[PDB]
Amino acid sequence: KIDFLLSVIGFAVDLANVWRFPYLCYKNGGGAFLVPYLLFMVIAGMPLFYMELALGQFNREGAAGVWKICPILKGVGFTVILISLYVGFFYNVIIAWALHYLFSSFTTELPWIHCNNSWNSPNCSDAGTTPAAEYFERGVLHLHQSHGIDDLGPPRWQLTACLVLVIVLLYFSLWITATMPYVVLTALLLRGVTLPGAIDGIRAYLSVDFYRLCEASVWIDAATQVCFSLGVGFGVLIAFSSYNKFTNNCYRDAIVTTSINSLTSFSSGFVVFSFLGYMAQKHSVPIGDVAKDGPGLIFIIYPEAIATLPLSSAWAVVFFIMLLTLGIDSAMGGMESVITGLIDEFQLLHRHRELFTLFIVLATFLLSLFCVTNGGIYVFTLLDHFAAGTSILFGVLIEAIGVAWFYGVGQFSDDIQQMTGQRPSLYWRLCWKLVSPCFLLFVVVVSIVTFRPPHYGAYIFPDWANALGWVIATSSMAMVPIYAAYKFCSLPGSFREKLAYAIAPEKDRELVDRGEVRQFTLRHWLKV
Ligand SMILES: CN1[C@@H]2CC[C@H]1C[C@@H](OC(c1ccccc1)c1ccccc1)C2
Ligand SMILES: *[C@@H]1O[C@H](CO)[C@@H](O)[C@H](O)[C@H]1NC(C)=O
Ligand SMILES: *[C@@H]1O[C@H](CO)[C@@H](O)[C@H](O)[C@H]1NC(C)=O
């Protein structure tokens, strides 16, 4: 009971629900993003969470070692590793910013208050631009000294020192902590509720605009955010569930996890939009013109909310300590999963583990050094747009198609019944077989066909930036066909002989050899 309670609480609050969710909610309107989020969640987030839990718990192997049930579909074990590496590249800049803010918040006069600092412009408006946004973009990022993604400039030494500290802390780390976010968020929520002009920001939150529901960006954003929040599509759920006993049940875990995650996301968006409405009322501007729909929205929103609070310095220190802890936890989880999977896959990198871990850490630091330069927000935006999205949805769709069609929904249900004593009902089987793959395929095709170039406020990325982004997405996406070709060419025999062992499970060896392959009959495919 205590261990199970602490298990659900751990996944409840993370960097996805605190940082990315309000950004994507403000970008898409507020309710026109809430509707697709719930629609995609209740349909294809719980079934995939349950499927990943059961697969990991039964196979008792890592992200790549599970695929002995469909030997040809193993490139999705390296696709997820590449995706996690790409995410971890830009996942450290958030922690560097948090460290910078925590260090700079150790004073009696906060710097994001008034328009008298050396990093200000004649456009600054004290109750143009706000002092908090001007501080973030001109005294921390120094974005005004870069023309665009073409003109980056040398890295800054302060953010480089913060990055080095983050890297060493992560490497050496790789009751009180688990309850600080709840208290801090409750204080912020109460303060935002009891503020003038918050009702407008709440009305703008709980109101659906049908004109944006006919687009595609909001559907793609909701689909990607569901996977980012729940944790599916990264290969960490399978690795974690590899040690989840055998008799532990998975549907009860999935239901509670999904419910708590949804509640936390809703509360975070509520707080952010309430403060947005207050500031819009204060500055005599509409809610849609307060700030830019960029990744650094919380770093502009939250300093002002702390400033409107008594004893603002202590609250600032506590908030940024909490943010640093959350980022460290998420980064540790991702890097641990990547390293463990790579070590397990190759038996050569087992006598040399510390060297491999040091090499991975060094490479991640070197490739994350690109976002510390003057124009690093452009590289951050490009990575955020292109590392996840089409690649993660493609990997999730391939995993679902494999596990369901190529293996057997009935066989998966029989395995689950053997594991836990209860065979899944018709809702789960139908969702695994038909409902989820169709909605994933539609989203993938829509995302691929539609253009949607990235931008940062008013900067428009050139053609070569989009080409590079598509290159780095395709690099992760294209691990399935190459492994399929290698596996097909490695097996011996003829076309039928190779195809028999390429798709049948490794537990089916004694039966495929004696002229009996289950995947060669219509009844196997036509069953739900
Ligand atoms: C990209 N990774 C990040 C966030 C999503 C995916 C999953 C991974 O898991 C974390 C985690 C922490 C809190 C909430 C949700 C996920 C994790 C940390 C420590 C130990 C295990 C897992 C971290
Ligand atoms: C702003 O800065 C100037 C010069 O640093 C200083 O003299 C002044 O007192 C500050 N405040 C106002 C309200 O001008
Ligand atoms: C400041 O405002 C003026 C318009 O009054 C605008 O032309 C200029 O580009 C602004 N400066 C910056 C750095 O955005």
Domain map (residue ranges) of the chain: 2-490, 491-528
Q: Which ligand is nearest to the CA of 119?
A: 3
Chain-centroid distance, C-alpha 306 = 27
Which residue type occupies 362? L
Pair 221, 27: CB distance under 8 Å:
yes
CA distance 391 to 481: 14
Is residue 296 helix, strand or coil?
A: coil
The candidate with the shortest Cα–Cα distance to 415, out of 245, 236, 246, 235, is: 246
Which atom in ligand 3 lies closest to the alpha carbon of residue 121? 13
CA distance 157 to 40: 43
Which residue type occupies 15? L
The candidate with the shortest Cα–Cα distance to 253, out of 509, 437, 406, 56, is: 56
The stretches of 105-209 forming alpha helices (DSSP H) are 131-135, 157-173, 180-193, 198-203
The stretches of 286-311 forming alpha helices (DSSP H) are 298-307
Write out the two tokens for 359: 């090499």
Is any atom of ligand 1 closer than 6 Å to the C-beta of 334? yes
Pair 256, 67: CB distance under 8 Å:
no
Chain-centroid distance, C-alpha 345 = 24
DSSP code of 520? G
What is the greatest pairwise CA distance in the chain? 83
CA distance 278 to 198: 5
Is any atom of ligand 1 closer than 6 Å to the C-beta of 234? yes
**Residues with Cβ < 8 Å from 42, sequence gap 6 or more?**
none
The candidate with the shortest Cα–Cα distance to 79, out of 484, 500, 507, is: 484
Residue 273, Cβ density class (10 Å: 0-12 exposed, 13-18 middle, ≥19 buried):
buried
Residue nearest to atom 2 of ligand 3 (CA): 123
Q: Which ligand is nearest to the CA of 340?
A: 1
Residue nearest to atom 3 of ligand 1 (CA): 330
Sign of the dihedral defined by the CA atoms of residues 515, 516, 519, 521, in that order: positive
What pairs with residue 230 in β-bridges? none
Pair 254, 46: CB distance under 8 Å:
yes
Residue 91, Cβ density class (10 Å: 0-12 exposed, 13-18 middle, ≥19 buried):
buried
Type and span of the H or E element at 252: helix 251-283
Write out the two tokens for 113: 């208050």
32-49 burial, b at 16+ Cβ within 10 Å, e below that, comes to bbbbbbeebbeebbbbbb
Pair 55, 403: CB distance under 8 Å:
yes
Report angle CA 141, 143, 147 to the nearest 5 degrees: 155
CB atoms within 10 A of CB 154: 9
Write out the two tokens for 403: 């596990």
Residue nearest to atom 1 of ligand 3 (CA): 123
Q: Which ligand is nearest to the CA of 115?
A: 2
DSSP string, 12-73: HS-HIIIIIHHHHHHHH-SSTTHHHHHHHHHHHTHHHHHHHHHHHHHH-S-TTTTTTSSTT-
Method: cryo-EM
Residue nearest to atom 10 of ligand 3 (CA): 123
The candidate with the shortest Cα–Cα distance to 418, out of 249, 305, 282, is: 249
Q: Give the resolution in Å.
A: 3.0
CA distance 361 to 351: 18
For the chain, the first-to-last Cα distance in angstroms comes to 35
CA distance 232 to 48: 7
Residue 360, Cβ density class (10 Å: 0-12 exposed, 13-18 middle, ≥19 buried):
middle
CA distance 384 to 395: 17
The candidate with the shortest Cα–Cα distance to 159, out of 373, 320, 362, is: 373
Sign of the dihedral defined by the CA atoms of residues 10, 11, 14, 18, in that order: negative
CA distance 242 to 374: 43
Q: Binding-site residues, please?
A: 10, 12-14, 17, 84, 88, 225, 228-229, 261, 265, 326, 329-331
CA distance 265 to 365: 30
CATH number of 2-490: 1.20.1740
The candidate with the shortest Cα–Cα distance to 258, out of 236, 217, 227, is: 227
* Ligand 3 centroid to residue 261 C-alpha, Å: 42
The candidate with the shortest Cα–Cα distance to 64, out of 50, 81, 83, is: 81
* Ligand 3 centroid to residue 57 C-alpha, Å: 58
Is residue 456 helix, strand or coil?
A: strand
Residue that has been written with the tokens 């039964």 in this structure: 58
Chain-centroid distance, C-alpha 3 = 25
Is any atom of ligand 3 closer than 6 Å to the C-beta of 123? yes
Phi, psi of 459 (to 5 degrees): -70, 135
CA distance 231 to 288: 30
Is any atom of ligand 3 closer than 6 Å to the C-beta of 121? yes
Pair 14, 325: CB distance under 8 Å:
no
Which residue type occupies 413? S
Is any atom of ligand 1 closer than 6 Å to the C-beta of 329? yes
Residue 462, CA atoms < 13 Å, CB-side half-sphere? 6
Residue nearest to atom 2 of ligand 1 (CA): 334
Q: What count of residues does the chain have?
A: 528
Write out the two tokens for 340: 């463990």
DSSP code of 119? T
HEC letters along 181-243: HHHHHHHHHHHHHCCCCHHHHHHCCCCCCHHHHCCCHHHHHHHHHHHHHHCCCCCHHHHHHCC
Is residue 126 helix, strand or coil?
A: coil
CA distance 210 to 297: 25
The candidate with the shortest Cα–Cα distance to 482, out of 66, 76, 86, is: 76
Residue nearest to atom 6 of ligand 3 (CA): 123
Pair 185, 318: CB distance under 8 Å:
no
